Symmetry: D3
Subunit: 151 residues, 6 copies
């Protein structure tokens, strides 16, 4: 089924929010299939944020995403992409609603805790998952509790 | 004797370990439990609970779901209680329920959507569902003292 | 398998701790098979606390257990009786360790939140479950997640 | 920012044991406590705090409530705090507040709505409410080192 | 009881955003907040607070720490509070504290052990520490109505 | 470069939705994550991880369990970290683990006991298990700034 790249940004890691974020996505019933603590180098960052290469915030973006380790993940479940952006709330954490990840934990745009593939960008999920993870690092399993999450 | 609403952790809620989490949002919200029963819904009881959907495609699978494992059936009392419960639960379809609600936090399905609560917008749905699942000998008439601090 | 009678006392109910207690016992992997919000009358109380009928605290005990509603339960799982008294902690909540129900939520002996059949009293569990619940009120089901809780 | 706002757990939040949850909420949001006092509010102080309401029918009910038990008074600081805190609280009427907010998880009353927070849409309310509850000697000037991860600048 | 104890989130607990968790812990235990102040501790006050330690080798490191950032000072009241609070905290050395206690869930240092609480085994420590941090005008006398369910008498 | 311990949410931890809850107790405790990998353990890898129990009755069922679903494999850094982790996890047999520990709170079995962490009392178990499950290219050398407030 549908998967999406999700990553806890260096602010999240530094602020010790990996658990809380993982718990939010497990508790929503979703299935972790890839998971990796790693540091993003500047060539990986440049390739990740490519779409923003002309923007005035780019150099600060790569600077930040490269400023400490992240926890990179793939998640699978029904409608996962969009479900995950709903959990995360709005991109600017100062605008995110309470009960979402950024509404609860951030109030900044740059240091906004987390990233999730944009479902409105068709193919963003598969392209980012293939950026961060090799097929060898992604795990096919059956989460048994899926029989009670879904009809 | 204030406003009561019927509320049900569905078999998926029970399977996934979520009874206490749901109960905790109801009491934390300040609502009072007056009935509470762990039970299996038999097929007649579900025909009656879901009589209004008998014509609809999803009916058969709805009756099979709601009888496919035990439920936790509840009655909850408090000011504007039906509607407060519908807001805590969020959208019937959990893929659209807002994060912070019970379905936005815990579910990713419309059939397997954790819980039921009476629809305040269907007039007398509460009184009827309560009366369907509970005898008046299993509702409990009590005063929750912290009520004195929940309301003015 | 083994079941045990567990009940949230009127202090627990009044203090809005039913959820938290239920969650603790579901999260430990145990299976709810009976569950009932009810009031204990004085004949049920007298029969429940019979063993304490001579003690100086009896009349205060029945008075309290009868002072508001309780939430009466049966729980099943491996070694359930003893596992549950371990969750509850010590009878006097002022002596219970932090991380147990009474260590976290009480500090009184009388108003000590909760009751669980005493595993050291052989047959206490079956005798109390049959006191509070008829066989019609207890549910036989398969909690699927039991396949991951137990070998 | 040096942006500060005044925040108060009201006598109901205090009585229901929710001082800690409200504080975790604000801390977890990355906001910096700079003032904080457990205290009783008396007649004069409530009449001034609420005086914008002196001509209103719920006024006497309100001074009676806000004076019926202790409150936890506070000041918090951070980017857009006054506004962020207001969003965290939810609608003034808890029965209208969205689940996820303080009021939507914990209240369903208008009078007993847990909590108060300076109105960002009333210019000066924050600095006025703070100077009401706190002398400048009771506010702390410090650096929450985690701020460098909450914010980029 | 009128049994009160002095409790302090230390500068590490304050910086790590744990004021709220510690307060929820105490509230949830059914204990009554009667005093509470966010504040900075200076030289004189620490030298007196800790003076039983004036002759010890960790003393200078300790005044430096307890003075390196703000603390949340408190007073709590209830049955056997001083002792209950001490058990809630766990061993003074967090790396020795049992999981379930404040120190065992959140610390693993001796210097930076989150929190302080009057020693019930030192007679007078509670009433002495409280009078140290609080004037009697800053303590509140009230009735937590839930107390009637926490206790039978 | 301080003390590191290897820690593993076992397949049951992963199935039951407990990865984040465990990770949250490790970070809340102040320990630093330096490695972290969601993976399936193959049979050779489990022969090596459990070589010391190869003679024992429970070995075969142990290798079948630990390969029966994916795991979350971690490395954790901090003062006295091996032993701090063994205390957070509590007794190997979860029916005896104390409430407050990860096993006392979440488990009721000895085989299905949620997590593994290196035994501080077996000298060099940490360095060896870490080296077994992680290449040195997947350990991350970083400074967690709130360390400045966790320790003196
Ligand atoms: N003015 C801006 C815009 C975006 N950004 C950051 O760059 C990231 C990617 O931007 P984006 O438009 O793809 O937003 P999302 O897909 O993450 O919602 C955001 O998450 C922001 O953190 C920023 O720092 N400043
Ligand atoms: N296509 C549909 C529509 C509803 N249903 C289920 O049947 C239930 C009752 O539908 P309903 O519109 O009366 O919803 P509620 O009153 O529970 O909000 C829902 O909770 C859905 O779980 C379904 O399974 N499939
Ligand atoms: N001195 C005492 C002893 C017991 N009790 C209460 O009576 C209950 C039953 O006593 P018990 O000796 O069977 O203790 P448990 O089986 O509940 O551990 C306890 O839970 C106490 O609440 C009391 O109020 N005062
Ligand atoms: N009709 C009303 C309106 C407000 N109030 C109370 O009075 C307070 C102050 O009114 P307000 O419009 O300034 O509300 P906020 O500034 O707290 O959002 C509220 O928090 C309500 O508790 C009331 O009791 N009845
Ligand atoms: N060897 C030691 C002993 C204590 N201390 C610190 O000094 C404080 C006071 O010592 P204490 O024996 O009165 O400890 P408590 O009364 O807080 O249990 C402790 O909380 C430790 O933080 C230290 O830094 N080094
Ligand atoms: N009879 C036994 C004993 C141990 N074991 C399992 O094998 C694991 C390793 O045993 P161990 O004594 O080396 O324990 P730890 O180093 O993980 O504390 C345990 O975590 C138990 O789950 C078992 O399945 N059956
Ligand atoms: Mg984009
Ligand atoms: Mg309907
Ligand atoms: Mg007994
Ligand atoms: Mg071993």
């Amino acid at each position: 089924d549908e998967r999406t790249f999700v990553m806890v940004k260096p602010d999240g890691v530094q602020r010790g929010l990996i658990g809380d974020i993982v718990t939010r996505l497990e508790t929503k019933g979703l299935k972790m299939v890839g998971g990796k603590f790693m540091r993003i180098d500047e060539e990986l960052a440049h390739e990740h944020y490519a779409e923003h290469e002309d923007k005035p915030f780019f150099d600060g973006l790569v600077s930040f995403i490269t400023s400490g380790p992240v926890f990179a993940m793939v998640w699978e479940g029904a409608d996962a992409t969009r479900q995950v952006r709903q959990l995360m709330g709005a991109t600017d954490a100062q605008d995110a609603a309470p009960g979402t990840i950024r509404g609860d934990y951030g109030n900044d745009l740059g240091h906004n805790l987390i990233h999730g593939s944009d479902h409105e960008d068709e193919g963003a999920n598969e392209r980012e998952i293939a950026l961060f993870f090799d097929d060898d690092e992604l795990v096919d399993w059956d989460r048994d509790a899926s029989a009670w999450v879904y009809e």
